[PDB]
Amino acid sequence: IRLPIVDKYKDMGTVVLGKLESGSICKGQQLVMMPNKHNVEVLGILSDDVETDTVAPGENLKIRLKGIEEEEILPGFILCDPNNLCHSGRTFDAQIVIIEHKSIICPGYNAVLHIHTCIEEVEITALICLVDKKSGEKSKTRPRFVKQDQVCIARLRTAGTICLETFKDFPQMGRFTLRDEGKTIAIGKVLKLVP
Amino acid sequence: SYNYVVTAQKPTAVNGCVTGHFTSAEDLNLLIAKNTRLEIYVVTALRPVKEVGMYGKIAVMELFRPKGESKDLLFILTAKYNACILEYKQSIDIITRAHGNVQDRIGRPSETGIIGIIDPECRMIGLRLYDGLFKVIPLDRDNKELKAFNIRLEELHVIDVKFLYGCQAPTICFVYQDPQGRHVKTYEVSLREKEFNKGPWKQENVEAEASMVIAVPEPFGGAIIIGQESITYHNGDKYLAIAPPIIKQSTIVCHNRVDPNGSRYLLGDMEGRLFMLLLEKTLKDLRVELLGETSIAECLTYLDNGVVFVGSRLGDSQLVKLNVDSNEQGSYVVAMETFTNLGPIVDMCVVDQGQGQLVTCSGAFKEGSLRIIRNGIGIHEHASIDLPGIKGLWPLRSDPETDDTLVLSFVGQTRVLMLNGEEVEETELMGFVDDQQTFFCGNVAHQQLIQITSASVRLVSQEPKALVSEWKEPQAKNISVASCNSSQVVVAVGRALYYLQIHPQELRQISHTEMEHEVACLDITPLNGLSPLCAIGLWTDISARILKLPSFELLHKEMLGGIIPRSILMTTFESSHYLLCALGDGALFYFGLNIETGLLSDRKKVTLGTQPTVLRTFRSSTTNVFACSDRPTVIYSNHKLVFSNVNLKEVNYMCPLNSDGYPDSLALANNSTLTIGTIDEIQKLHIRTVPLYESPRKICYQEVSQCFGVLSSRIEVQDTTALRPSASTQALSSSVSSSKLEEVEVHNLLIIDQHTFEVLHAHQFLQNEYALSLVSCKLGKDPNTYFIVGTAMVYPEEAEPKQGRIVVFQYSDGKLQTVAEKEVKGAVYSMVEFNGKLLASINSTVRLYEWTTEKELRTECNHYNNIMALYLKTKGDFILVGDLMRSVLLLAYKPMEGNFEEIARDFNPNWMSAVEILDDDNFLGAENAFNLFVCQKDEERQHLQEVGLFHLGEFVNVFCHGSLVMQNPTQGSVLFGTVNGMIGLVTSLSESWYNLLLDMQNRLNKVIKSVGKIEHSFWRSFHTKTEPATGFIDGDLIESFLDISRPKMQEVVANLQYDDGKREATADDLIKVVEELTRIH
């Protein structure tokens, strides 16, 4: 199971919001809540308006949490099954089709990284390869600057901390948008998580 | 481009035949349908009445007797869906009562094709036009005007539909197929409501290949069902089924009722074998009995007395007596009359040294036959007699009426034959000298006879016969030339001549002149009683002169350049007076003569042969001219002299006859035989018939060995032993290309002699070889002329052809040499003589061979096309390449390269069946739906324009350049053959004349009556898409300006502007024009 965390309204004990993306979530089902490792117990589901004590994916939940951390949970955390739970860290590699730019993004660039719910600042540290988007020719040599239209795999270090997934391992969670000055500037997938 | 069409020979093939009462309810008629033509006959112990031309391919023909009418009425439906009912009037006029085009908007035609049927009650015609729709025309007098309605069929695949006799409401009955098998079903027609209502009976599955449904009269009622193996009868819940072995070997296609009762029925075979069917009586059993071989019957029609008209499309149509007592010859049928049939014209060629005649591959299978077709005047030989060396001939009148006496001359002699019916006999005629060469005799005035000899001009008595007065040269020499009439004689002696008068008991002298040089030909023929002028021709001055009588004063001396005059004459045609002057070299100057004034002028010069020519007047009742030479020649007339050849080998001399035995006749003498017969009135086409008993498939003429090469195909069964002797199992010399080291098609190159039409040699190609092309030609620099064949190799497993041959042959002495070969990697569709080089189509390629000294084919130059090079023709450097898909390709050899180059092309998807070149720029061809079209040459030059379409109505197989009149308005010529056996022709007009002769047409259509009231400008509109013809001119109309009455002409020519340096038109200006256009066949 997985659940992005969109916001935490402080009522009764504590609550939160988000689209339930993975795995059905029982009443009083023991789950984990990520980038801090925290234990929590399900008290009250408020699926949309209604309360169904179970609720499968693709449904908008207002979950009422009970754990150590009651607030000091942010948007950009998730809820996890305690067995095979969520990766995180703060470095990753990503295919990055650049979509809008007046010249040349060029290593050491500073942009924001809209992942699922999380919104944090990021830098593309170095770029790995380019792609001839015709075929998917994994570029021979190392690029030294990517332009518009043009696809590049590259390594990002967010200045804080995320909770990624690899695309494929997980779709909805991996898809993300770099976003400078508001204009989406690339959409990308995340392939591999660096330490 | 602007062209002109015309039919030389009307189509010959028989679409349909039907018995009925149509001219008269007393009379009994056969009505024959020759495609666009409709023949009516009358039965006797036949006699014609009226043949008439539809503007349509008769698609259904049925007579039927509506209630309360005097005689049966005929219904014609055509191929562009034209319908009409007809009546015969007696002066004679076939009259369209009803008419109309029943063409629907939506539909795809039935695969079974058009089946029109009337009900026996005279209620409705039934037209199974499109798939899944039974059209009905109801026989009330309100349907006069085109008006009909369809009904829905469940069933699509309908093999055969027929109305059922003996039912109280109209009943149709039909077989139909579906993935559950073939079933026979019946519906009752519900006219009032417009639908079908469940019929009396229906059977499950009949015979697999059951394709015919007879509907039997109302002693019995119901229907019979034919197939391959089974004839099956059905009415109500009766079921008869015999599977005779005596129809195993082939199929049943045509049938007819013999006697109205419907006991007896004719049944014809796809391979001829005429059978009768019996219905034993109600109904009990069936019996079939061999009757015999017929011509391959398309349709059958029993008149009475045991006589039958067999119509056929392949071969000659028959009239067949069938007895009840069979001969040991074989069986029960005997051939009475052979109706010629240029059945499938498949190839043809032009021949012969002038004019030219026409030879065709013709018919198929056992009917297959060459045809020789020639354009001249016929003569019915009553009397031939082996009698030699006749150098002069004259008739005589031994008792005043009717000739009874023929006088004959031989060098320094004479004799006499007296006529007593059909028996010629020796005689002596007192006062005639039997031992000097007679130069003229005949009857004369005052009841007398006049012989004229080398010596003596001898006037004789008729009442007790005896010389009464004789004339001699004052000094007693010989007379050289002698010319008489009724009264006056003008004999010549070498270099001077005399003028006698006939009186009683007295010839009397008058005028003795002296000429410039010695005279050769004389005539005195008169234009009142006695001729005051005279025709002369001189030996050195070589000069036709006209002299005055008594005086012998000159008047015109038109000096021809030269050889010596050999005769001369003044006669009259229609109402203008001419002078002719036939020479030795065989030319014939023909002039315009003035009785009164004396002048000649308006010369014309023609040639009649390299033999001296002999000019003779005669009647048969206007005044003709019979010339004598190599090529016999009758002259007549409509105000343009018409020189027509005559169907006989040289005539040296002739004379008119008019005896108590041979009236209005003609006696004529060649070097060996005396012939007496009666001539026919105007020149027709005559056809020589060369029975092969196997299918011909190509033809050509090797001039320099007076023989035809002919590819052909017999049929044989498997062990390979044939059915019958054909024109390839019986030649003099008989070769083969390989030894002995269900049907099958054996190919043979025949060789045929252009005189005898025996089969000299019958070569036999390989096993599983197919003979495609054939040609006679000289090649390279070499004076031999070879007979080249091209083949393809036909294995059934292989779907294209992988290999073939270009086999040169030679015909020398009495044998057929196999000179060279070239194995080829495909199919030799077409080959052609081209600049002394062999040029061949092979699959998708045009290959050009040279002919090396070593006597082989080296490939000069190669060129690949997209179109399967099926068609090929050429002129100059240019090549025209056709494929079955109307895709056309113009190519040019360019010598200074050694390469072919594409000049032009055109690809409009349609079926093609031949093409031609008319000149550099234009290309005749016959695309689908019996059509013509012509493309024109003039970056974007490589597009051949569409510049003419027309709806012919005949399936063209072959075009070849040529004519059927002497050498000598039009430009060019192109004959064409045809499946319907028709022969046509094409020629370009100049622009000026296209104008009038279109303008003309419109006019004639308003005036002219169409058989079924079908408009001319639709018939001759192209069909599948549909458009009205441009660039052509139906001559077959133009011409029919002459068979209309004199008022109707005036009508036509009402408001025109005739072209001569130009004023208001007369009928007499077009009469002229239309005749100048009956003289190209």
Partner: protein, 371 residues
């Protein structure tokens, strides 16, 4: 062996879209106006399925609309040297359509299908970039039986019939009237629809395991998607109206053009006739789209000479489900040819194969003789 249905429903794109069972043809010779997207080069055969992903808005704006009405758009046969002289083309009907706003950018998928060939009259440029097209329709010219004109009017009743001897009992009974013509049974067959297809049917059975149309018109247009021909050739096929004419100028191609060389250096063999095979039901080659707005009329051949590889086997956006592609290219000139497909499971057949994009192939006739 896998399932021969998965590739042709293009399951790579996006689970389920919004299908349109709707019809919308234009009666023949009709003078209609149609719009044509920028970017999409390709000559589009009728019957042939064309997927498409469309990025720019102008494109989307056009698409999103053409969902309320026709769902048909045009596609212009280009010969490159024409130069805005697009003279023919084809009507592509949208039988499918899903769009999704959830990635973080406007995206569209469709699945079109050619409907009618046509002639270009005039091309007019709205300033959005999209064209509209003054367009005559082409019909289908369909000749009746060769032996129609000349059929015998008593031998019409056995024109109809209820292993390969049947073909020898077809030709002798169908073209019997050949005799009446200037030509024999076996020729008229080389132009006979029924027979032609059946010869093509044999040439698709060596490609294995087949079912398909009865109407030749459709059989022609079908097989034409399978023929891996260059640009300028592809055209002649389209232009050729008659099915017969088409059926033929298809069989000339299957039989002659054995070698598929590389289209850059020209003489560098890459595969042969022998080594083509039907993976998709639509045949070996069909048109698939990649995740950037490109098309690959791409061929399924067992082996192939003269190829490098680069990268490593990936199953990202694999048209083929359960296979995995690796980029291939010319040894010589380095230009791209296709993708080498490798299996993942160990109980699938063609354990390896080669998908080759058409834009990289050049059918050649062996030898320097007929060539």
């Amino acid at each position: 062996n896998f399932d021969t249905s998965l590739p042709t429903s293009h399951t790579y794109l996006g689970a389920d879209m919004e299908e349109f069972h709707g019809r919308t043809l234009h009666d023949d010779d009709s003078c209609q106006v149609i719009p044509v997207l920028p970017q999409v080069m390709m000559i589009l055969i009728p019957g042939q399925t064309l997927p498409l992903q469309l990025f720019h808005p102008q494109e989307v704006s056009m698409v999103r609309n053409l969902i309320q009405k026709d769902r048909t758009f045009a596609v212009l046969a280009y010969s490159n040297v024409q130069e805005r002289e697009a003279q023919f083309g084809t009507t592509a009907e949208i039988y499918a359509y899903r769009e999704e706003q959830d990635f973080g950018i406007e995206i569209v998928k469709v699945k079109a299908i050619g409907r009618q060939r046509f002639k270009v009259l005039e091309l007019r440029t709205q300033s959005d970039g999209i064209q509209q097209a003054k367009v005559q329709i082409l019909p289908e010219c369909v000749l009746p039986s060769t032996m129609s004109a000349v059929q015998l009017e008593s031998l019409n009743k056995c024109q109809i019939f209820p292993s390969y001897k049947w073909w020898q009992k077809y030709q002798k009974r169908k073209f019997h009237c050949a005799n009446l013509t200037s030509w024999p049974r076996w020729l008229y067959s080389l132009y006979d629809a029924e027979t032609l297809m059946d010869r093509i049917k044999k040439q698709l059975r060596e490609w294995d395991e087949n079912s398909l149309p009865s109407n030749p018109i459709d059989f022609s247009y079908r097989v034409a998607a399978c023929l891996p021909i260059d640009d300028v050739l592809r055209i002649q096929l389209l232009k050729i109206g008659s099915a017969i004419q088409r059926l033929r100028c298809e069989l000339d191609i299957m039989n002659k053009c054995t070698s598929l060389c590389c289209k850059q250096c020209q003489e560098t063999e890459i595969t042969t006739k022998n080594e083509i095979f039907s993976l998709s039901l639509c045949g070996p080659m069909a048109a698939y789209v990649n995740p950037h707005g490109y098309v690959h009329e791409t061929l399924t051949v067992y082996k192939a000479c003269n190829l490098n590889l680069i990268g490593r086997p990936s199953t990202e956006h694999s048209w083929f489900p359960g296979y995995a592609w690796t980029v291939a290219q010319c040894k010589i000139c380095a230009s791209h040819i296709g993708w080498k497909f490798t299996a993942t499971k160990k109980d699938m057949s063609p354990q390896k194969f080669w998908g080759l994009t058409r834009s990289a192939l050049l059918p050649t006739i062996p030898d320097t003789e007929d060539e």
